[PDB]
Design a protein around this ligand. Structure first.
Ligand SMILES: N#C[C@H](O)c1ccccc1
Ligand SMILES: N#C[C@H](O)c1ccccc1
Ligand SMILES: O=Cc1ccccc1
Lengths: 259, 259
């Protein structure tokens, strides 16, 4: 038969590995292996976000997973939202362990501006945070900006096409997090030899109210991808609102990287 | 249109508030109110179980939920598995805040033997722990026994009638826990004037492979209930395998304590 892949799934800020609970079994039933990474201070990780002061600390469970893969094994690496930044850091360290990067309703950084550039661009134009709570934590690495989503903001901007059950689950599991924008703006730019040499594709939702089309076309313009895929009717949490259609996009990506 | 009630939902050891993610919108969409408590060192709670040495510290978030209710409000308090022990401790403190106790596939303690008695009896009787990992932690006041479920034991004994998604979700969220057996052996008997005075019913799953049919009959013989309800086809995690039939049971119980 056709050969399968190992997908490594990377969640977004304020969430954890649990968001993949629908997608993981569809991928395994089709014969693939799946590793749902849990980032620092996310999900049931024992650290509060105040103890994770840098984006390198945040990403470390991703680096470790790639480090421990046996030699010559390559993965399909999927990053969701802020997970786009994580997957790019990983790519600049272990480029040869990644078959293709999958930017899913994700931030897509480039190899020319500071790594915060696409975050900073969006933050300027963003619109309405609603009942979200902002705060600060002072560290030996400077001031960290934290946020915790409000439930009305979740309902209107992230979960608007999701079953009520998934909305209620997200309320019981989401945590205070950070986009690490200060730390990212001080970081060495992503390299051309690393991150820049890896294959990459972009999967977008049509009804994402966080990352508008508008903005995606701009990120892709600054930094091209091989291919773009579209999930009709998906909200931002597309693995919860349309998991079957996300499965179909990921199979088709798998089939293009058989070689 | 009848009186609606307020349901306080209390999860089992090694799990969290998340388990109620299907049941909560069923109850709310029929007019009821629902608070799903998260216990110490459970779900996304920032503490490890090592730091919660006693079943009073473990139960504190439940106790704070009842204390914050307005004057004269009463709840239907639902306690799943080890949550049966939690709801008993609460009923000994605030008997007048509880319309009825609902022991759902739960440990039902009595007012004659020490509070650890139904737990010690099950532990002598159960032969299918599987890949579950047991350990000790030494506190300033004695040994604290701990456990962490293994995935094969989860699938065989707790989740065997659940959709594969819900078993994947549990594997991403379950944590090391404790039954506090040593602490409960040292604790004073539950009282007649408090816990004993409160109305109680038992709701049981017809295919529970962890709390078997016979053990239930034994527990109810040490300590009578007003009424027993059965859910046909339920596994132990019946709010995940048969949420609509668990909804039907809890509406029937709300109809008997209408007022
Ligand atoms: N990264 C990421 C998430 O999609 C996210 C989390 C909180 C607020 C906006 C967006
Ligand atoms: N309490 C409780 C849970 O149902 C439970 C947790 C771990 C192992 C067996 C049973
Ligand atoms: O505004 C920045 C931003 C970053 C991540 C998710 C949503 C917004």
């Amino acid at each position: 038969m056709e050969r399968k892949h190992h997908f490594v799934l990377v969640h977004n800020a304020c969430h954890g590995a649990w968001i993949w609970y629908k997608l993981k079994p569809l991928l395994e039933s089709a014969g693939h292996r799946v590793t749902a990474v849990e980032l620092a201070a996310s999900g049931i990780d024992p650290r509060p976000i105040q103890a994770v002061e840098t984006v390198d600390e945040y990403s470390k469970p991703l680096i470790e997973t790639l480090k421990s893969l046996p030699e010559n094994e390559e993965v399909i690496l999927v990053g969701f939202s802020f997970g786009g930044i994580n997957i790019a850091l990983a790519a600049d360290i272990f480029p040869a362990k990644i078959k293709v990067l999958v930017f899913l309703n994700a931030f897509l950084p480039d190899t020319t501006h500071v790594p915060s550039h696409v975050l900073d661009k969006l933050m300027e134009m963003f619109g309405g945070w609603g009942d979200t709570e902002f705060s600060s934590h002072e560290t030996r690495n400077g001031t960290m900006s934290l946020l915790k989503m409000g439930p009305k903001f979740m309902k209107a901007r992230l979960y608007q096409n999701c079953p009520i059950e998934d909305y209620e689950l997200a309320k019981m599991l989401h945590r205070q997090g950070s986009f690490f924008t200060e730390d990212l703006s001080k970081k060495e730019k992503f390299s051309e030899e690393g991150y820049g040499s890896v294959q990459r594709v972009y999967v977008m939702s049509s009804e994402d109210k966080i990352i508008p089309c508008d903005f995606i076309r701009w990120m892709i313009d600054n930094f091209n991808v091989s291919k773009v895929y579209e999930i009709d009717g998906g909200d931002h949490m597309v693995m919860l609102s349309k998991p079957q259609k996300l499965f179909d996009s990921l199979s088709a990506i798998a089939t293009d990287y058989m070689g």
